[PDB]
Amino acid sequence: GSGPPGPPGPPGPPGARGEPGNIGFPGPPGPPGPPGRDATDQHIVDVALKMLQEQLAEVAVSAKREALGAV
Amino acid sequence: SGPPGPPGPPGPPGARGQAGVMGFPGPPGPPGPPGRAPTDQHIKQVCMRVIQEHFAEMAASLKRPD
Amino acid sequence: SGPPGPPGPPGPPGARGQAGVMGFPGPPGPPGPPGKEASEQRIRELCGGMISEQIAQLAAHLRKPLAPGSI
């Protein structure tokens, strides 16, 4: 008749490999750029000098036309 | 003769998965603030400077009707 | 004796991988746009009068006064 129960069986096989890690979050934006360059004085200087040249020339024209009576 | 033994223990845990991918890099920052434009007072002040630095030139042309 | 028992069940799934790290910061933004230059028209508006007044004042200094100005 019966001998004893056998010994315990072997360990089961290894479980399945784990899934790849979760996706990384997006990086932060970079900082704002530096301030743009300020408008320089040159454009104002240029127009002022033109206005001065114009008005000074007009002094001579006015004087000449005054004498002629053709203002 | 005899019954089979008891069941074996569960197997070992599986291997760990591969690391996840790094996140995308962030967008570029915003452009900077605009540069400064001339105020009306600043315009006036430059004109004043130009006039004051040109009195000699003005005087030359004011004699010219002679 | 009896035979060995049956194998155990499979082991649990392996752990998920290490989480992805956060993305790099983005680059600094570009420089802001340049300051807008004043228009020639606005310069003429703001400076025409002072040029006229200083011209008239200098003409008097030089004892060459001009045509009378507007009231």
Side-chain angles (χ1 to χ4, degrees), chain B residues 1-40 43-44 47-48 51 55 58-59 62-65, chain C residues 1-39 42-43 46-47 50-51 54-56 58-59 62 64 66:
Chain B
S1 35
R16 179 131 181 225
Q18 59 181 288
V21 68
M22 179 182 285
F24 284 131
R36 285 173 30 173
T39 61
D40 291 344
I43 291 162
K44 287 183 206 164
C47 289
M48 286 183 64
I51 291 161
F55 282 130
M58 297 168 56
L62 289 167
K63 304 156 173 181
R64 238 110 89 68
Chain C
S1 115
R16 185 180 286 282
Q18 199 81 339
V21 303
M22 177 170 55
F24 299 122
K36 291 191 180 76
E37 290 185 342
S39 63
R42 180 56 172 168
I43 297 156
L46 292 167
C47 306
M50 68 174 47
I51 289 171
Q54 291 301 121
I55 283 177
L58 180 58
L62 298 174
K64 307 272 287 181
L66 305 185

Side-chain angles (χ1 to χ4, degrees), chain A residues 12-64:
Chain A
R17 176 178 298 92
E19 294 295 324
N22 285 314
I23 302 174
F25 285 75
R37 40 194 51 125
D38 297 335
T40 69
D41 287 357
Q42 197 66 56
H43 68 291
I44 304 155
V45 166
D46 294 343
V47 169
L49 290 168
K50 171 153 61 161
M51 295 172 74
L52 266 164
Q53 290 245 33
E54 293 167 356
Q55 290 201 29
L56 292 172
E58 176 68 37
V59 169
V61 173
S62 171
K64 174 183 173 177

